[PDB]
Design a binder for this molecule. Sequence first.
Ligand SMILES: CC(C)CN(C[C@@H](O)[C@H](Cc1ccccc1)NC(=O)O[C@H]1CO[C@H]2OCC[C@H]21)S(=O)(=O)c1ccc(N)cc1
Ligand SMILES: [Cl-]
Ligand code: NA
Lengths: 99, 99
Amino acid sequence: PQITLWKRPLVTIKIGGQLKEALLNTGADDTVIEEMSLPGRWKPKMIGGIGGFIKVRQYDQIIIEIAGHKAIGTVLVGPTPVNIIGRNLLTQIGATLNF
Amino acid sequence: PQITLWKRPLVTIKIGGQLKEALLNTGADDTVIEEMSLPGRWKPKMIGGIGGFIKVRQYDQIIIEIAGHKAIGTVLVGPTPVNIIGRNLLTQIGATLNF
Ligand SMILES: CC(C)CN(C[C@@H](O)[C@H](Cc1ccccc1)NC(=O)O[C@H]1CO[C@H]2OCC[C@H]21)S(=O)(=O)c1ccc(N)cc1
Ligand SMILES: [Cl-]
Ligand code: NA
């Protein structure tokens, strides 16, 4: 796809069998999803956004489908205003910015 | 150009006579720049993301040069940790996400 930016670049994702909406976010180093259950152990992470730093749960090697594209990588879980797909998974699906 | 997302998509911008580095941010509706003076009227706004909200000044009809391409639109000025070029200006330079 070639996605223009007149609207939010929202796509459907699938994680743990569940469809969710998420924003493709070139401004995010990391993928951050709202509270949900994920398998395995997690490790601590602090991430800094516009308003300050927060604690999140870091899960590694999570299978996620993004707009029909398969990715396997790190997902952060915490109080984000919207689910965000960051560069760690945008690279896996081959996304680029073009102008 | 085509910008890969292995690293943060940083570009040079010219705004208010000043060169700055900024992040191309498809996850942001509005452009937000670190504290600086801009001409004309403004009004206060609150914007929020991970870690909460910050108060900014909203300036309308500001010209920015983004990696060489001139665009005009609203610029928010405030204590953002990173200068961010949001969709409101990315659209004007014809930026798309491709995968
Ligand atoms: C949270 C998003 C819905 C919205 N944001 C833009 C977003 O891309 C920020 C943009 C950004 C980038 C760096 C620092 C602050 C904000 N990225 C961000 O918080 O990413 C976090 C997850 O990965 C980590 O990598 C970057 C910080 C972490 S935001 O900065 O909160 C925001 C809200 C409204 C406007 N107009 C502009 C920005
Ligand atoms: Cl267009
Ligand atoms: Na103005």
